[PDB]
Nucleic acid binder design. Sequence first.
DNA 1: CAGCTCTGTACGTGAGCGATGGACAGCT
DNA 2: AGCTGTCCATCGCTCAGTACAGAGCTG
Length: 199
Amino acid sequence: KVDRFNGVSEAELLTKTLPDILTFNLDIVIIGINPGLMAAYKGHHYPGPGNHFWKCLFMSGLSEVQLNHMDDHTLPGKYGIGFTNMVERTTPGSKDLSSKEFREGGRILVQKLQKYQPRIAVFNGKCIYEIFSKEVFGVKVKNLEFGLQPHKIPDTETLCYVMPSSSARCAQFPRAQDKVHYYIKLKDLRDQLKGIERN
DNA sequence: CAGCTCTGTACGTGAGCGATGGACAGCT
DNA sequence: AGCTGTCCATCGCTCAGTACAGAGCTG
C-alpha cells in the first residue's frame, strides 16, 4: 500500500465534493469535468502536482506570477476568473463517470451559466463539451474542435470555449507546453471582449 | 454497403511515494 | 580500523482524457 492522501482513504474522498467559486461579472469560468481525488482532498481547484492548469495559467500570461490551488479564491476579484465542474461527484478519472451523470451535470451547468453569465464559459476538457453541445444545442459534429464554439449559452451573451483537459492523464498533449496555446488564445479572446465593451 | 453509436484499448510526460544503498560522521 | 546508524540522492512504480479501431446496429 502507498499512502497518497496523508492517511485519508480513497473511499472517504469519493464522498467529498468541491465548492464552486462563482460571482457575477466574471470574464471567465473554468468548467472542470469533476473533482479528482486530490481536489476532493484539498477542497481547492486543480491541486494535482502534475495538473497543468496553474502552470498554463501562468505560462499564457493569464496570471503575472505562478499561482497554485491555494490561490483559487483570489481569482474572481484579481483576475476575473471563476470555477465550477460539469459533474459534482468525485472520481479518480473522467472514465468513471456515466452518460446520465454528465447529462444531469449539463442541465445544472447551463442553469448556473444563465445565472452568473460570465463573458466566457471555458470547458476544461473536450469530453464535457461533446455532451454539453448535444444536450444544450442539439448539435453533434463528426469533428468537434477546440477553441471558440459557434454557440452562445441560451438567453445569454456567454461564449463557449473548449480546451484539452488540464489533466496530465491526457497523452495527446503530453506537457503543459502543449496546452498553453489554448490558454493564450483564451487570454486574447478575453482582451478582445474587454476592448469592444470599453466603449 | 455505408453511416452511426458504443466500448475497449493504447498512448507521452513529469511528479510523489517507497525502496535502495553509498557517503559519511560518531563511536569505541 | 571496525562497526553501526542516518541522511539523502536516486530510481522504479504508479498515477493523473483523448483518439480511434472495430463490433453491433440500422437506414
